[PDB]
Design a protein around this nucleic acid. Structure first.
Ligand SMILES: [Cl-]
Ligand SMILES: [Cl-]
Ligand SMILES: [Cl-]
Ligand SMILES: [Cl-]
Ligand SMILES: [Cl-]
Ligand SMILES: [Cl-]
Ligand SMILES: [Cl-]
Ligand SMILES: [Mg+2]
Ligand SMILES: [Mg+2]
Ligand SMILES: [Mg+2]
Ligand SMILES: [Mg+2]
Ligand SMILES: [Mg+2]
Ligand SMILES: [Mg+2]
Ligand SMILES: [Mg+2]
Ligand SMILES: [Mg+2]
Ligand SMILES: [Mg+2]
Ligand SMILES: [Mg+2]
Ligand SMILES: [Mg+2]
Ligand SMILES: [Mg+2]
Ligand code: NA
Ligand code: NA
Ligand code: NA
Ligand code: NA
Ligand code: NA
Ligand code: NA
Ligand code: NA
Ligand code: NA
Ligand code: NA
Ligand code: NA
Ligand code: NA
Ligand code: NA
Ligand code: NA
Ligand code: NA
Lengths: 49, 142, 150, 142
RNA sequence: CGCUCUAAUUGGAUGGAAGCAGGGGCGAGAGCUCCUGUGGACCGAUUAGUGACGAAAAUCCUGGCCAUAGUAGCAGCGAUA
RNA sequence: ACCCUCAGAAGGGAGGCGAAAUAGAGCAUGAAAUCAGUUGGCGAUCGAGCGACAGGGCAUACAAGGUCCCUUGACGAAUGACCGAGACGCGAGUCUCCAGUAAGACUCACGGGAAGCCGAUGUUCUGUCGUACGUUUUGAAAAACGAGCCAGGGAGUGUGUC
């Protein structure tokens, strides 16, 4: 859940801004966002044997 | 009273007629800069080479004046490829034992930058005695 | 902050500096530019005339909308920035004072080097219409001065 | 006021374009040229159509401007400029080393360039540069 | 070709490592390497692995910054001080 | 610390400590965007994808590159003469011989020379070519879409089965 603990929403078109989820005027959740989730991170489920 | 480099600084390698010809060719012909397209138009775009991928790229399309695109036809002659401008083949050296097996007639040695002054002193005197030139010599007040 | 950007021979030179001055950096570039090469005493008399409004400081770079001045020679736009001028007088009072304490003739020494540097901004915020606020900052200026014997 | 011309061309009864073409070529070769008796230079054709073309050039223009000369002085000078890359360094230098004159301010009589002379006994359809200028409204100062 | 960390084999460093700046050499090229200054403690190579491994772009994200500009506003309100 | 300066527990100057204060307090290192001063080149008569490739000016401490210029001579691919002689053509001009000769890129040798001199680097001038980049598109310089600039971040991963 790293980076997913937020209700951030995108405003959509209208304010001259990219459609990026924001919370309190700060981008969040998405991989390109600072503090956003890791797109394809290491996983515990992986068989390393 | 003056600065002089240690070692056989003036030493030149002995090359076959054909190798010297090819070495002279490489020096005469040269090659284009091969810097990345439009690196000069944007500070965030560095000089490091990247194949132009744009479908409309002028350089990719081979338009005259937009710079040469990397191709195998630009390769240097096999016989001289990689040679120091002097004609010597370089041998990377880290210690005194690395000098062993080095042909001072055909190869010159380059002491890795990380090697300290104490070890360089030993390497330099031992190289000169073996008839091997040190490309990056220490300059002492002679 | 800055450090002296020019070498200075202690035996024939006097130094001085202003730190984090809250004044126009643009007025500062203009003033430095104009007093360089002058005698310490000359600069003082010049700046006092500026403060009085009898002598304009040429605004060669930051001149948008600036009205022309007849006393400006070889240029047109000029103004009378008293605040930055007063700070420069403090810089000269210090320099000339340091110079005197060292044995030199402070006033007669030439301004070998004078330069302003923007060291930062005291940040501020101005409430605007539509529930929005925008920047309302104050420049912070450092300035070096090196007096040299002539 | 004095012009050290290496060549002095006499334009009297000569075809302006053919002279200009040669004067352009020579000026580009480094020669300082002086065209003399411009008012007496000539252009072949039906006077009425010739005049219309030049009158049109006078009328043409706007705020940016299209300054077209009326005197035989300038007409010829401009005709030469059109045969030179006057906006390039070499072109401008050549053009500036060329000067046209009303009458002949020199002591020497100009030389007649080959293939530029017009035989009046064999031709009736042509006009004098001076005649063109008079029609254009120029002050006959020659 | 380059990046991280692991392993084996093997090297460099306070007689100055990494990094940074300017500069020299090599390679078609990815990129390798040297010199000088700064820096003041770590750093490689080969082989076999490893992978939150390579950016100019997404009205991309965050931070910093220039022009805009010494410009707009600091006048307008029946309370002109 | 002390002293001088100052409205002054400010700041500045001088000075002291330490290997180092450009380790002096959000103080290891200290990139880019960018700013001040300054150096080199250009510059108030001149034209705009900013360059690539050629070639000139001016500029350059060392190091890490050491080449480069002119006489002559040797070798000499394709190509390839002038002149002269003879013969044709109304004419521009052509044929035969001289001759595949002289010439002919690179490379080398002798002799002489350069050390800002050769390379290289900065800037600028000349020539040739040249309306960014990425994307959308049959067709993009596009009056189609995106970005002010820079740094850092930013997109084929795991399990199971086949
Ligand atoms: Cl290959
Ligand atoms: Cl400012
Ligand atoms: Cl007009
Ligand atoms: Cl032109
Ligand atoms: Cl006729
Ligand atoms: Cl060859
Ligand atoms: Cl993939
Ligand atoms: Mg996170
Ligand atoms: Mg760039
Ligand atoms: Mg105004
Ligand atoms: Mg409100
Ligand atoms: Mg091994
Ligand atoms: Mg891309
Ligand atoms: Mg931003
Ligand atoms: Mg405005
Ligand atoms: Mg009242
Ligand atoms: Mg620090
Ligand atoms: Mg369409
Ligand atoms: Mg990155
Ligand atoms: Na939360
Ligand atoms: Na697992
Ligand atoms: Na200006
Ligand atoms: Na005046
Ligand atoms: Na004036
Ligand atoms: Na005609
Ligand atoms: Na006109
Ligand atoms: Na935006
Ligand atoms: Na140059
Ligand atoms: Na698109
Ligand atoms: Na495009
Ligand atoms: Na269009
Ligand atoms: Na902005
Ligand atoms: Na990735």
């Amino acid at each position: 859940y790293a980076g997913l603990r937020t209700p951030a929403e995108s405003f959509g078109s209208g304010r001259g801004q990219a459609h990026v989820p924001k919370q309190d005027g700060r981008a969040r959740r998405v991989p390109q966002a600072v503090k956003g989730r890791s797109a394809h991170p290491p996983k515990t489920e992986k068989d390393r044997s | 009273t003056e600065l002089q480099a240690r070692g056989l600084t003036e030493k030149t390698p002995d090359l076959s007629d054909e190798d010297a010809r090819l070495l002279t060719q490489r020096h005469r012909v040269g090659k284009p800069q091969f810097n990345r397209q439009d690196h000069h138009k944007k500070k965030r775009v560095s000089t490091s080479w990247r194949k132009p991928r744009g479908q409309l790229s002028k350089q990719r399309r081979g338009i005259k004046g937009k710079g040469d695109t990397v191709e195998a036809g630009f390769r240097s002659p096999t016989a001289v490829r990689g040679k120091h401008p002097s004609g010597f083949e370089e041998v990377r050296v880290h210690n005194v034992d690395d000098l062993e097996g080095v042909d001072g007639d055909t190869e010159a040695v380059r002491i890795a930058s990380k090697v300290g002054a104490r070890k360089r002193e030993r390497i330099e005197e031992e190289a000169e005695d073996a008839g091997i030139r040190v490309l990056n010599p220490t300059y002492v007040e002679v | 902050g800055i450090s002296y950007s020019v070498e200075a021979d202690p035996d024939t030179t006097a130094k001085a500096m202003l730190r984090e001055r809250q004044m126009s950096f643009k007025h500062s570039k203009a003033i430095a530019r104009e007093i360089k090469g002058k005698t310490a005493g000359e600069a003082v008399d010049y700046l006092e005339a500026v403060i009085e409004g009898d002598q304009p400081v040429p605004f060669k770079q930051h001149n948008s909308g600036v009205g022309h001045k007849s006393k400006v020679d070889g240029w047109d736009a000029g103004r009378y920035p008293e605040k930055a001028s007063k700070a420069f007088l403090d810089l000269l009072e210090n320099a000339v004072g340091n110079a005197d304490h060292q044995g030199f003739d402070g006033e007669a020494m030439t301004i070998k080097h004078v330069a302003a540097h923007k060291v930062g901004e005291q940040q501020g915020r101005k409430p605007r219409a539509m529930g929005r606020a925008s920047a309302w900052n104050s420049p912070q200026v450092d300035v070096e001065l090196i007096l040299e014997e002539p | 006021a004095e012009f050290d011309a290496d060549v002095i061309v006499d334009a009297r009864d000569c075809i302006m374009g053919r002279v200009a073409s040669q004067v352009a070529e020579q000026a580009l070769d480094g020669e300082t040229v002086a065209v003399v008796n411009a008012e007496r230079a000539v252009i072949t054709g039906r006077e009425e159509q010739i005049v219309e073309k030049y009158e049109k050039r006078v009328d043409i223009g706007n705020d940016n401007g299209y300054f077209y000369p009326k005197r035989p002085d300038g007409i010829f000078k401009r005709t030469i400029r059109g045969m030179l890359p006057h906006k390039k360094q070499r072109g401008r230098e050549a053009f500036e080393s060329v000067r046209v004159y009303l009458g002949n301010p020199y002591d020497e009589d100009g030389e007649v360039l080959d293939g530029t002379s017009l035989d009046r006994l064999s031709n009736i359809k042509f006009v004098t540069l001076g005649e063109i200028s008079e029609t254009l409204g120029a002050n006959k100062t020659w």
